[PDB]
Every structure is written in C-alpha cells, then in structure tokens.
Scaffold this active site. Structure first.
Site, mmCIF file in Angstrom:
data_model
loop_
_atom_site.group_PDB
_atom_site.id
_atom_site.type_symbol
_atom_site.label_atom_id
_atom_site.label_comp_id
_atom_site.label_asym_id
_atom_site.label_seq_id
_atom_site.Cartn_x
_atom_site.Cartn_y
_atom_site.Cartn_z
ATOM 1 N N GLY A 115 -14.575 44.757 48.465
ATOM 2 C CA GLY A 115 -13.458 45.263 47.709
ATOM 3 C C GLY A 115 -13.310 44.677 46.327
ATOM 4 O O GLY A 115 -12.552 45.223 45.523
ATOM 5 N N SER A 147 -15.932 44.830 44.424
ATOM 6 C CA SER A 147 -17.090 45.348 43.706
ATOM 7 C C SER A 147 -16.656 46.243 42.544
ATOM 8 O O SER A 147 -15.570 46.839 42.556
ATOM 9 C CB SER A 147 -18.046 46.086 44.645
ATOM 10 O OG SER A 147 -17.551 47.328 45.079
ATOM 11 N N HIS A 202 -22.354 52.215 42.310
ATOM 12 C CA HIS A 202 -22.216 52.386 43.757
ATOM 13 C C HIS A 202 -20.802 52.803 44.166
ATOM 14 O O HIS A 202 -20.621 53.324 45.268
ATOM 15 C CB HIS A 202 -22.646 51.098 44.489
ATOM 16 C CG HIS A 202 -21.619 50.002 44.478
ATOM 17 N ND1 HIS A 202 -21.828 48.788 43.855
ATOM 18 C CD2 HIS A 202 -20.377 49.936 45.013
ATOM 19 C CE1 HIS A 202 -20.755 48.031 43.991
ATOM 20 N NE2 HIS A 202 -19.861 48.701 44.695
ATOM 21 N N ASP A 220 -27.024 48.939 38.949
ATOM 22 C CA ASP A 220 -25.724 49.290 39.500
ATOM 23 C C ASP A 220 -24.697 49.144 38.389
ATOM 24 O O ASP A 220 -24.115 48.083 38.204
ATOM 25 C CB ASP A 220 -25.412 48.393 40.690
ATOM 26 C CG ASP A 220 -24.244 48.888 41.490
ATOM 27 O OD1 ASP A 220 -23.794 48.128 42.374
ATOM 28 O OD2 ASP A 220 -23.784 50.033 41.234
#
Lengths: 245, 10
Positions: A195, A197, A45, A96
């Site tokens: 933030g 991630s 992502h 992801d």
C-alpha cells in the site's frame, strides 16, 4: 510504512494519494509524487489492472486517506502514461514508472501551499556526495503481516543499499539491475510496505529534497536481507522530460 | 502479481 511515525502532509507536501473510482466512494490504491504543477509520477504497476485515466482521481494535500482534508486538492487524470517497457516477471516489476497529468474540474493544476509542493527531480549526475538516508512516506501497512491499513499518513527514514549489495544472492540476486534502487534500515526495522507503492523515496541532494525512487517491490516489509526496491528515477530523467517538458 | 509486489491490489 513500518516503523517511523505518523505525520501531517506538510512534512511530505509532494505526496499524491491516488484512488480508483468505484461503481460508491473511490478506493485508495497507490502513492505518488508531484514533480511539477500539472504532473504526478508514480508506479506503472498501479494502473495495469485498469489502465484508463478516467478511472482514477488524484488528491494532493492529504494526511488522512479517504476523508476530506483541509487544503485538499482533487484532480482528474488528463493523461495517463505508463512506461513503454513496463514488465512483470513473477518476482518483481521492471521499468515501473507512470506519469499522470492532473487537472481539476475548473481546469487548474496544483496550487502551491504549505501542504502542496512539487519535489525536485534528481540531477544528471552531481559532483559532491550526499547522504544515503532518504525518507519514505505513505498509507501502506505498518507490518507485513497486518491485515488492515493505517488510514493516516506515516513517514520514515531508510538508507540506500548499493546495487552490489542488493544483488548478493542472500538479497535479491540477479533480479536487481541498474534501473532499480534498494533502500533498507540497517537494523531492518523500518521499510515501505503493502500500500505504499507508487510513493516517493526522498533523498537530500544539493540541499534539495529529491525524488530518487518510487516504491516498486520488496519481499515482505522490513525483512532481514530484503530491502525495499525502488525505480531509480535518475535513470528516467529524459523519459520524464520528453513527456512533461 | 509478482511474488514481491507491495501493491494494495496484489
């Protein structure tokens, strides 16, 4: 990171800070984890809005985002691989996970130091239980309602939450599947946040610090009955091995 | 952007 403490990268030496080039210094975008000298795992992502390797730079060995760090290593993305089944569904991410083959301008991969180390992938299954307290680290917000980001690296401890618990309707219901990993604080006081991630979920397995998950989504941060959700890395071991091996 | 993103750009 909500809760926990500020720390230097020597406590998270696999941590990779992923930035995007600007048209004009690069903007921090996502965390990541060094899983071999030339390869960084992170969240797919992080790359959807601009999925070109050329537009990203990866730094290893950083405690302070967006400034020079002693012992830093700057890398170009030689190869950007996003999972073929990556998908968004209005609440959450699926599949992801991304791989980044990194290389400096002089051709090198990561050089191990006190501040730059690979982290182990999880075993195929292991017999012998381990603890479900796992570390998280990153540059994300310190509270879900903060504007502004902390600029220095933080780390904390969360506990794995069973799929069965995470799929309770009070939690995330049918949005959780076997490919995800939930982790929360039993008192709901520390969590990954906006933030963080792409960053790592580090569990201690067979004595090894181990990349068990990648920060993917979560409703807010440290909200009650709303764990952080992580890509279950162990599920993708043969995806990973078939690309980096 | 899915509602529960923790992505800096969402």
């Amino acid at each position: 990171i909500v809760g926990g403490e500020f720390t230097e990268v020597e406590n998270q030496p696999w941590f990779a800070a992923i930035y995007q080039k600007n048209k004009s210094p690069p903007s921090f975008k996502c965390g990541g984890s060094l899983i071999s000298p030339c390869w960084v795992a992170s969240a797919a992502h992080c790359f959807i809005q601009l999925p070109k390797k050329e537009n990203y730079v990866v730094y290893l060995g950083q405690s302070k985002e967006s400034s020079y760090n002693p012992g830093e290593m700057k890398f170009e993305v030689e190869q950007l691989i996003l999972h073929e089944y990556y998908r968004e569904d209005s609440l959450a991410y699926h599949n992801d996970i991304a791989l980044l083959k990194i290389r400096t301008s002089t051709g090198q991969c990561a050089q191990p130091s006190r501040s730059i180390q690979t982290i182990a992938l999880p075993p195929r299954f292991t017999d012998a239980p381990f603890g479900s307290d796992c570390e998280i680290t990153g540059f994300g917000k310190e509270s879900e309602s903060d504007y502004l980001y902390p600029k220095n690296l933080k780390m904390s401890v969360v506990k794995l939450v069973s799929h069965e618990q995470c799929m309770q309707p009070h939690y995330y219901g049918s949005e959780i599947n076997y490919k995800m990993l939930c982790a929360a604080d039993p008192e709901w006081k520390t969590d990954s946040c906006k933030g963080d991630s792409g960053g790592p979920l580090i569990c201690n397995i067979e004595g090894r610090p181990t990349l068990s998950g990648i920060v993917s989504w979560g409703r807010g941060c440290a909200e009650k009955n709303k764990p952080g959700v992580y890509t279950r890395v162990s599920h993708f071991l043969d995806w990973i091995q078939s690309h980096i091996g | 952007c899915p509602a529960y993103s923790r992505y800096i750009g969402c």
